[PDB]
Write a protein that binds this ligand. Structure first.
Ligand SMILES: Cc1cc2nc3c(=O)[nH]c(=O)nc-3n(C[C@H](O)[C@H](O)[C@H](O)COP(=O)(O)O)c2cc1C
Ligand SMILES: Cc1cc2nc3c(=O)[nH]c(=O)nc-3n(C[C@H](O)[C@H](O)[C@H](O)COP(=O)(O)O)c2cc1C
Lengths: 109, 104
């Protein structure tokens, strides 16, 4: 299904890997999204308290699961059930982050 | 949940990334699997015809979805619903394979 990998060691933690399900989910091409921060999926109705929560889980470098409003390339509004997981190397060094994305409406339970 | 990514530019197509779900699923640590080809999950009652199928999809550089007996570290049997996906670069060269696993 849908997942991405970001590189926090790079400027602004860009997406550096994107699965086919993620492209299908967002209506974006892999060219369009590699090198960018995932925040591009956010828009007007997106709750900032939730974004701050994501900002906080990333700062602390801990995993989390949230539900926030995202937008496809064509402007379609969806609940993104978003799970983050930090990844450290063999010496406890943060190397990446991973994200698994779900359409919350397709998965209300 | 469970996903690995492999590099087919490197010899023996090793696992270069693994999600925690795959760690939890297979009972291995990230250390024990990075740099290794995912075939170590295979074992004695694993269908070799299913293995040749995977090996075909990899050579053909196309996606497949198969199901096969795999083994956790402690030697526990599970039916692995395995989906593979080839990944090219912008100029069309094969750069990665990704895999999603399900306990069937
Ligand atoms: C691995 C990973 C995947 C992410 N996926 C999404 C996503 O699918 N949708 C979204 O709105 N934000 C996603 N984010 C969060 C944004 O990339 C960003 O971290 C968040 O908006 C906080 O950044 P900001 O407050 O500076 O804008 C993801 C973050 C990470 C680390
Ligand atoms: C990304 C990826 C993930 C894979 N995951 C598994 C797996 O979970 N279980 C398994 O038995 N084989 C898995 N394989 C297949 C083996 O790594 C290998 O391709 C298969 O054994 C055929 O190669 P071989 O005949 O040379 O061993 C995966 C392959 C790739 C490319």
């Amino acid at each position: 299904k849908n997942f991405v990998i970001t590189d926090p060691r790079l400027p602004d933690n860009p997406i550096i890997f994107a699965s086919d399900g993620f492209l299908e989910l967002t209506e974006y091409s892999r060219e369009e999204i590699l090198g960018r921060n995932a925040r591009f999926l956010q828009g007007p109705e997106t709750d900032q308290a939730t974004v701050q929560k994501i900002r906080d889980a990333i700062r602390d470098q801990r995993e989390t699961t949230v539900q926030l409003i995202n937008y496809t390339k064509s402007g379609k509004k969806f609940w993104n059930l978003l799970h983050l997981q930090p990844v450290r190397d063999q010496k406890g060094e943060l190397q990446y982050f991973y994200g698994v994305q779900l359409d919350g409406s397709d998965h209300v339970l």
